[PDB]
A paper describes a structure:
We thus performed additional studies on the homologous enzyme (75% amino-acid sequence identity) from the oral pathogen Treponema vincentii, TV0924. This protein also exhibited acetate kinase activity, and it was amenable to structural and biophysical studies. Our structural and biophysical characterizations of TV0924 revealed that the protein has a homodimeric arrangement and a two-domain fold, both of which are similar to other known acetate kinases (and, more broadly, to other sugar kinases). Enzyme assays demonstrated that the protein has the ability to catalyze the substrate-level phosphorylation of ADP, forming ATP using acetyl-phosphate as the phosphate donor.
Numbering used by the authors:
A (entry chain A), B (entry chain A): -3 to 449
The structure:
Amino acid sequence: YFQGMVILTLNCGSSSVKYQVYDWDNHSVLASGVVERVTQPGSVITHEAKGKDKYVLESPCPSHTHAVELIIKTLTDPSVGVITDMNVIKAVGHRVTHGGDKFIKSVIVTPEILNTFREVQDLGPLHNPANIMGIEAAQKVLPNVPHCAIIDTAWHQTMPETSFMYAIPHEWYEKYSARRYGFHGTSFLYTAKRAAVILGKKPEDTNIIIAHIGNGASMCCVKQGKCFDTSMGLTPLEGLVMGTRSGDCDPALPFYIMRKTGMTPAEMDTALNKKSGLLGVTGQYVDRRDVSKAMGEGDKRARLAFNMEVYRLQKYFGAYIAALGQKPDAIVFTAGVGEFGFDTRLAVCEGLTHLGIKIDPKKNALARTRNAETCISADDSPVKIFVIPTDEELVMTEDAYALMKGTYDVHTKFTYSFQSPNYVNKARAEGLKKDLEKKPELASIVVKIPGAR
Amino acid sequence: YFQGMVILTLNCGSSSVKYQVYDWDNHSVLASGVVERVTQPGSVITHEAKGKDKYVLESPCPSHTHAVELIIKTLTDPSVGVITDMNVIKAVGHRVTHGGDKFIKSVIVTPEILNTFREVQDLGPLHNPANIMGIEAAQKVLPNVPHCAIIDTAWHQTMPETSFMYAIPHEWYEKYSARRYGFHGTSFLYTAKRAAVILGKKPEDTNIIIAHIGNGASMCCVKQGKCFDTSMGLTPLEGLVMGTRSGDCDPALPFYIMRKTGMTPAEMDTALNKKSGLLGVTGQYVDRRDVSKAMGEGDKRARLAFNMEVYRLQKYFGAYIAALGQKPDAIVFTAGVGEFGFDTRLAVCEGLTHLGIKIDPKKNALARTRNAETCISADDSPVKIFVIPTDEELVMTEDAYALMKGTYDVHTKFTYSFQSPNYVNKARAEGLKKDLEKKPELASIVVKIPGAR
């Protein structure tokens, strides 16, 4: 088939470049991978091509430009590559963490848009610099395609002022744009649209609450198909318990600890972002799988951390049920913990039965796959409970494709491929076949999509 | 009657001493008042004796000791005083803001207890110093009676670790006692016991949520008669919108503003505590009455502030309903806004009807008095809604009396006078008679107390 409608997506950190290559016309992920230790000694690419063994190559990358060059060379390599030449790529979608209130939707990057991103860089100091370096790097390597910014905060720009304002001097909002922004926008967008499909409803008629529980974790209250409130803040620090981030805390606590320790703002910022969360409580574990294993071994710090995560999730579900003003149609679990953390999901939902959330423990225990969307609520639960594995890369891919085509708009005026009842994820469909060979009962909880033919 | 069982209560700030004199055996408030501008030029006492016109006298008070001496001289004065001599006072109850996790209940002050308070002073740096100066001052003026500490954090010491731990390095808890403490303890204790009386239930069987909405504002989740969670934090800054405090905020926001402004921790701490909240949003108003009046005049900043307060209250009610694991027996509004802010109460409760909270707007509009406990929910509301005017001074009075007598203990093992169905507040009963002359329909919403004869 025609292989020339390929989209590259990139997510660049201070020392890494994650990539995916998507063939739009054949609806397939051709490859994904990561360059690690970018700007550091020992840079190394790990490249996973469809149907091939993992490929690993050490090659120095003192800059993000070297990392993008290494990706392209690997993708076009005759033996391990997946595209015939670099011109097979027709657009690049880049992750940008923070758009302030200057960006409500994805954009094609221009010099003026880059200047605008510089205005907001100070809102996302720990993330935007490397995202922008990645844009600048890829623009040099792939100069003849549109480079698009898909912005983690943009989904949340529908929040009303009563949700996004902090109770702070109004001049801090007016002069410094201090307000709640929220993150995980591509994940919430994707899972909100999938939830509408599963419910058989137009998005604008849906009222749902989504928990993206990954290493970073946040919740979104989706009222009439749009973000109404979300748990992260000006920055990704606020809200739920996370792997290394504190989430919610008395704003005066960091200042107290500073007076006790001598730490300065940047150090306190690092402690709250890199040494808190589950790692801080347990003293050693970031991954929820390690927390759960240690709890089962009797580790009281892990048991505490697990329970703190559960309790804060319960409180946020309660808060956002209140915020919705009505019973939600559904709650959604996504990201790694949402998809695999059956014990977290059980403990959260068992504490919410008086709010209409009734999990079925047998269904919940079966939902331990990234390859299927499932319903784990009891048949008669007032509120449906879905596990919807996310697909941030597909949002980035489709935004770049639609911007390149000229049809992209904000989601209240734009229709995504994955809003179709007949949308399929080819790689996940193949993985599900394998999952069902080993656990046939999983088939009984896969969602039944209205109108899917 | 015998007039010699008198208790003095004191609440000392950096420039003020508030006092009340309670005759225990005659169950009556003899006087209350305040010395203002203590330690400052123009110190002045305002003294309100039962049945008398307000008395105001300017008299220099360079120290809290001078302020306590002025109070005692005024109380024993032949024309404006209320007690024959200083030895009529048999105990003094002092407000202490912060007890850390070292104090779970009220105590008679000794030198060793004062040393222990010094260990925890750094947890309550903005409040404890003047509270302790007040103790030391009154011990010199009234050396022959017990001085008792009634501690705003103590009520909350029943919180379990899953509620009180922040997701921070465990060493910050272990070395610096960093955790959630909560405040308004005397108000929550009093109103929780009154709510149990009104419900006709033993306290240990009650599950209620209390909103103390004063200039400072916080909420308490009372599970099985004990604090389970509360909205203030390590310090009084966390949680609800307040007159000048921010409440909840991304912990990284103060550090961002610092980089934008040059402010240092103590200054940022002052901005978040003294220039935020309603004052920050509106730019000029602290009192909810001014916010509501300005909203009615069309002030968009006041309308925003009012709505932010309402919305955060809704979210906390939702969170604490979740935390309870069951429908609450009741929600309670108290303190000045809880007692008089009918518009806040209406807006909050109308957004919670799907959580069982059904206000009756006619009842709600009648509940604008400090002189009665009322029920403002619809007759068939799943969750009762009570307005219970608080009485922090009575808790302080009774704790001091019971400590002096030797019967005091933590509230799970001690019975207060106001747990009786037949408890009456004499001054409020007289004020209610006057309220009913002007608004007879108020009588229809006054609580009917089971077992009250």
